[PDB]
Structure 1
Amino acid sequence: TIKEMPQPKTFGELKNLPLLNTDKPVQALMKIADELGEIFKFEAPGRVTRYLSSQRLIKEACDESRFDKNLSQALKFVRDFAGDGLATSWTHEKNWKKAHNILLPSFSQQAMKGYHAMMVDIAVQLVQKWERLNADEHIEVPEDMTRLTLDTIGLCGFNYRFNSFYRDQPHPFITSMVRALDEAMNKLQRANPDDPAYDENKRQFQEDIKVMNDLVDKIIADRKASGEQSDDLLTHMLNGKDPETGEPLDDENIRYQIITFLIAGHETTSGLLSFALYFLVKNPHVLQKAAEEAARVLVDPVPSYKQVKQLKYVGMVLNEALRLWPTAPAFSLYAKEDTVLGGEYPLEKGDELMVLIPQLHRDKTIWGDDVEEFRPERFENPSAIPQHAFKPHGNGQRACIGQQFALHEATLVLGMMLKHFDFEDHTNYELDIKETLTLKPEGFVVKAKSKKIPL
């Protein structure tokens, strides 16, 4: 029952590459998936991949005995500054399992209890900023969520204060990082990357990489000269030993991990919080239910770890926002051996796949006809959700190591936001999703009305 899969329109020797010549390539691929279905072929000079959109096929792709994590072109470009850190290493590179073993304890339950107080420090700065706005001033939502999540990973992970709420402009790190991600995304469609027309892009790219590395230098220097006894993510990077190889990380890999966690440890969580607030102001009945939980649970001026664990509806709100707009919107796989996908599509060893997460999460055979509605109650019973229907944090041993960190931070912050303020979609904002490999609303603004509850 071998089928021929469809393929979108081609451009001669450039094949499908010009389809990525847009500022919103993930959304363009979603529209292709709408037209072509659960699987389509995508070619560029020297490369072939297959985009999967249905739970029927993705549940097979998630079989770790058949498929391993592949570096997409995007991740290969990110590797120019993230090296063999956790997110851009191959599973078979020594430093992947070594760093995985060393850093997994930094995301245990006991570790999260240790980060909690510093998460509250940054969250309180967010609430105070909003309490201090004048009448009819508004909130720039993705901007302030990025201030929050960057400061949180800096303080919790490295005992470094980016002090983002003391800046009306982004931190230099953010400006360079966004420019590196922009360059990586735009480079995806470049047929002749070594054409001298891109000499300035290459120079600017190196300049943005040096800005990020300079900050890494300061974080490392401050810790090794510090007189304070820290037990955080950087402590494990500098001192943990891998049980398997017995070795600690070396200096080069440590630098790559710091870059990796500063980027991956804040950018997608700021997108999640932005999308969650968007869906809440567009669905006031859901906001009210979440606000009722926040008022009932957060009975102290400062939230505790145990109280955040009881914000169960807030957690469902966050999962439903990750269903509709997963902020790391794709991951890539390669076949470990010859195999047949769905009884219909034969693959050879080494053949690549792309998992298109926002389209997976719109599979009507899984979620029903109301798939575009925001309904957190979908997540009331994980046993009622078929396997591999919901993949916002990737798959298997290569799934997101920071998932618990992100969800604890986002649940804490969204809970405090709903405890302390009413929110108004005063512009009737039309959703506009900016792409930087990752996904985030652009131009989303709201007004907050203080409930005048002291901190």
Structure 2
Amino acid sequence: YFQGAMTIKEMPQPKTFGELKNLPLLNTDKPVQALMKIADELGEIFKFEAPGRVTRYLSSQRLIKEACDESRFDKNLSQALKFVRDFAGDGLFTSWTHEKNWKKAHNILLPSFSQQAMKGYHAMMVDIAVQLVQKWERLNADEHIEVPEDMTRLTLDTIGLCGFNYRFNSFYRDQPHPFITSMVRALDEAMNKLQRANPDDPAYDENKRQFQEDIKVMNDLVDKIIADRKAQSDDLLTHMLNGKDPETGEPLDDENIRYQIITFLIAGHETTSGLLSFALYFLVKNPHVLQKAAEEAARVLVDPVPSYKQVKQLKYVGMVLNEALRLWPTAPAFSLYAKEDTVLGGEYPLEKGDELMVLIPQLHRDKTIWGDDVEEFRPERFENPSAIPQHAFKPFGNGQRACIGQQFALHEATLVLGMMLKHFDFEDHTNYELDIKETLTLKPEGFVVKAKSKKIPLGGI
């Protein structure tokens, strides 16, 4: 019998504008937030076209759980990732599943994220966490904290030290590390290119020039890391350099190693910085949640510095992080393509190769899954993990292409937020109005607070 969908209706789609299709609709520096509004209006699925391309944005758990079926759909590189691939090449994040270096690097680097490797990263994470705490302990009366800026100093340094035994020393710089400045500019350019109908017009030559320069800065730091490793440890970098793919019996080549380093420096800190920023934002806006989290930190972190086991015991702190990720997943979308012609949700036909975009913040506001208080920050929703439907919560992607650093990210973040809550009281002194800056990833912009030391001693790392 014919295998088409039983019933097929018009595919929702927002206003188009001639040959520019839907492109105009995202003439904004907050494209994900605009897509969320479109999803509110059009529902669980809508088509989005730009000259030369088309995709379908998914917002419901019903459809997304099917999209997460790896036998039917594989990771696709969204137009966004295609632009990032120009400088991150075939590193783990921007490689195709069937591209040679994906599986190869995957096999070689996965051990760097094993339970035993995490335990081994703990002392280094504490090293950078103590630097964060000491910075705040050392501020004068009239001073405040630029939250995302300081979370970025902590997360870059953490991945730098744990992964490459290299010290960026971000807390010794009063302006952002150069790498951060070029990285942000480079992601912002990738994002802005999404709305350029004619990317090749000479009007974008200065943009390209700057992009090249920012990629150069990032690559110069990579050389320094590599040279510094030549000038002992067993870390991510050690594995990149020596690990052999148990399937090919060979290590990664020099070209791919460089892309992996760029990849881990970016993916390994940016979204974690965003997460820590959103979680503090939500904590200062929900005083009672903050106190309950503070109480757990006080109760668990009874030592000068957190032990690995204690971090594992910060259960409520971990629920706070998961709730900050439900509301504002910092890598807001991931893309898939159909491996064969197929029908999604019994009613949306797709041809082999068709693309889907999982709009994670919308998936995380699916009322049929979370109830009607989706906009509220309530960590208790994560009280019992078992209760959450499969594929309902996906801030870290899906399947074999899921985030390889998920456990590293949540451990770092739990440790740090735990220590912050133990050592300081916080004040949203400016009644901060949430302003979400988008550079593909998401982060609060201008978020500032005042921290008042509880004056609890800190121990030697």
User: What's the TM-score, normalizing by structure 1?
Assistant: 0.99
Residue 404 of structure 1 deviates from its aligned partner by 0.5
Residue 152 of structure 1 deviates from its aligned partner by 0.5
Residue 136 of structure 1 deviates from its aligned partner by 3.2
SS of residue matched to 1:386: coil
SS of residue matched to 2:8: coil
> For residues 454 and 48 of structure 1, what CA distance do their matches in structure 2 show?
56
SS of residue matched to 1:88: coil
Residue 338 of structure 1 deviates from its aligned partner by 0.8
Which whole-Å deviations, capped at 9, do the CAs of 1:366-422 have from their partners, x for residues lacking one? Answer: 000111111111011122111110000000000000001100000000000000000
Residue 94 of structure 1 deviates from its aligned partner by 1.0
> For residues 79 and 185 of structure 1, what CA distance do their matches in structure 2 show?
13
Q: Does the 8 Å contact 1:4/1:345 carry over to 2?
A: no
1:290 aligns with 2:296: no
Residue 44 of structure 1 deviates from its aligned partner by 1.1
Q: Does the 8 Å contact 1:136/1:447 carry over to 2?
A: no
> For residues 451 and 3 of structure 1, what CA distance do their matches in structure 2 show?
61
SS of residue matched to 2:93: helix
> For residues 112 and 71 of structure 1, what CA distance do their matches in structure 2 show?
29
Residue 20 of structure 1 deviates from its aligned partner by 2.2
> For residues 111 and 5 of structure 1, what CA distance do their matches in structure 2 show?
47
> For residues 119 and 348 of structure 1, what CA distance do their matches in structure 2 show?
46
Q: Which moved more, 1:260-269 or 1:235-244?
A: 235-244
SS of residue matched to 2:356: strand
SS of residue matched to 1:65: coil
> For residues 179 and 26 of structure 1, what CA distance do their matches in structure 2 show?
18
Which whole-Å deviations, capped at 9, do the CAs of 1:20-76 have from their partners, x for residues lacking one? Answer: 221000000000001111100111111110000000100100000000000001101
> Which of 14, 20, 28 is the aligned partner of 1:8?
14
Residue 213 of structure 1 deviates from its aligned partner by 0.4
SS of residue matched to 2:343: strand
> For residues 386 and 177 of structure 2, what CA distance do their matches in structure 1 show?
43
SS of residue matched to 1:242: coil
SS of residue matched to 1:388: coil
1:436 aligns with 2:442: no
Which whole-Å deviations, capped at 9, do the CAs of 1:307-326 have from their partners, x for residues lacking one? Answer: 10111110010000000000
SS of residue matched to 1:215: helix
SS of residue matched to 1:125: helix
Residue 3 of structure 1 deviates from its aligned partner by 2.0
Q: Does the 8 Å contact 1:178/1:436 carry over to 2?
A: yes
Q: Does the 8 Å contact 1:147/1:165 carry over to 2?
A: yes
> For residues 133 and 311 of structure 2, what CA distance do their matches in structure 1 show?
17
Q: Does the 8 Å contact 1:26/1:329 carry over to 2?
A: yes
> Which of 125, 130, 151 is the aligned partner of 2:131?
125
> For residues 14 and 254 of structure 1, what CA distance do their matches in structure 2 show?
39
> For residues 51 and 266 of structure 2, what CA distance do their matches in structure 1 show?
30
Residue 224 of structure 1 deviates from its aligned partner by 1.7
- 1:4-153 equivalences in 2 (<5 Å): 4-153=10-159
**Structure 1: gaps spanning 5 or more residues:** none
> For residues 142 and 334 of structure 2, what CA distance do their matches in structure 1 show?
42
Which whole-Å deviations, capped at 9, do the CAs of 1:79-118 have from their partners, x for residues lacking one? Answer: 1110000000000011000000000000011001111111
Residue 451 of structure 1 deviates from its aligned partner by 0.4
Residue 131 of structure 1 deviates from its aligned partner by 0.4
- 2:259 is matched with 256
- 2:456 is matched with 453
> For residues 176 and 202 of structure 2, what CA distance do their matches in structure 1 show?
31
Q: Does the 8 Å contact 1:52/1:355 carry over to 2?
A: yes
Which whole-Å deviations, capped at 9, do the CAs of 1:1-31 have from their partners, x for residues lacking one? Answer: 1122111011111001122221000000000
> For residues 424 and 218 of structure 1, what CA distance do their matches in structure 2 show?
39
> For residues 332 and 191 of structure 1, what CA distance do their matches in structure 2 show?
21
> For residues 378 and 85 of structure 2, what CA distance do their matches in structure 1 show?
37
SS of residue matched to 1:87: coil
Q: Does the 8 Å contact 1:120/1:303 carry over to 2?
A: yes
Which whole-Å deviations, capped at 9, do the CAs of 1:275-334 have from their partners, x for residues lacking one? Answer: 000010111111111111111111110111111011111001000000000000000000
Which whole-Å deviations, capped at 9, do the CAs of 1:141-167 have from their partners, x for residues lacking one? Answer: 001000100110011111111111111
Residue 169 of structure 1 deviates from its aligned partner by 0.7
- 2:365 is matched with 362
Residue 246 of structure 1 deviates from its aligned partner by 1.0
Q: Does the 8 Å contact 1:98/1:242 carry over to 2?
A: yes
Which whole-Å deviations, capped at 9, do the CAs of 1:219-242 have from their partners, x for residues lacking one? Answer: 0011022xxx11111001001111
> For residues 318 and 3 of structure 1, what CA distance do their matches in structure 2 show?
39
Which whole-Å deviations, capped at 9, do the CAs of 1:242-278 have from their partners, x for residues lacking one? Answer: 1111110110000000000000000000000000000
> For residues 367 and 222 of structure 1, what CA distance do their matches in structure 2 show?
49
- 2:403 is matched with 400
> For residues 127 and 270 of structure 2, what CA distance do their matches in structure 1 show?
19
> For residues 362 and 246 of structure 1, what CA distance do their matches in structure 2 show?
45
SS of residue matched to 1:273: helix
> For residues 431 and 409 of structure 1, what CA distance do their matches in structure 2 show?
24
Which whole-Å deviations, capped at 9, do the CAs of 1:142-195 have from their partners, x for residues lacking one? Answer: 010001001100111111111111111111100100000010000001011010
- Runs of 4+ in structure 1 deviating by more than 6 angstroms, as ranges, are none
SS of residue matched to 2:313: coil
> For residues 380 and 316 of structure 2, what CA distance do their matches in structure 1 show?
8
Q: Does the 8 Å contact 1:21/1:186 carry over to 2?
A: no
> For residues 294 and 87 of structure 1, what CA distance do their matches in structure 2 show?
34
CA RMSD, Structure 1 to Structure 2 (Å): 0.6
Q: Does the 8 Å contact 1:275/1:440 carry over to 2?
A: yes
> For residues 323 and 352 of structure 1, what CA distance do their matches in structure 2 show?
24
Residue 135 of structure 1 deviates from its aligned partner by 1.0
> For residues 151 and 404 of structure 2, what CA distance do their matches in structure 1 show?
21
> For residues 341 and 76 of structure 1, what CA distance do their matches in structure 2 show?
25
**Structure 2: gaps spanning 5 or more residues:** 1-6
> For residues 20 and 135 of structure 1, what CA distance do their matches in structure 2 show?
43
- 2:219 is matched with 213
- 1:415 is matched with 418
> For residues 143 and 102 of structure 2, what CA distance do their matches in structure 1 show?
47
> For residues 429 and 214 of structure 1, what CA distance do their matches in structure 2 show?
37
> For residues 292 and 52 of structure 2, what CA distance do their matches in structure 1 show?
52
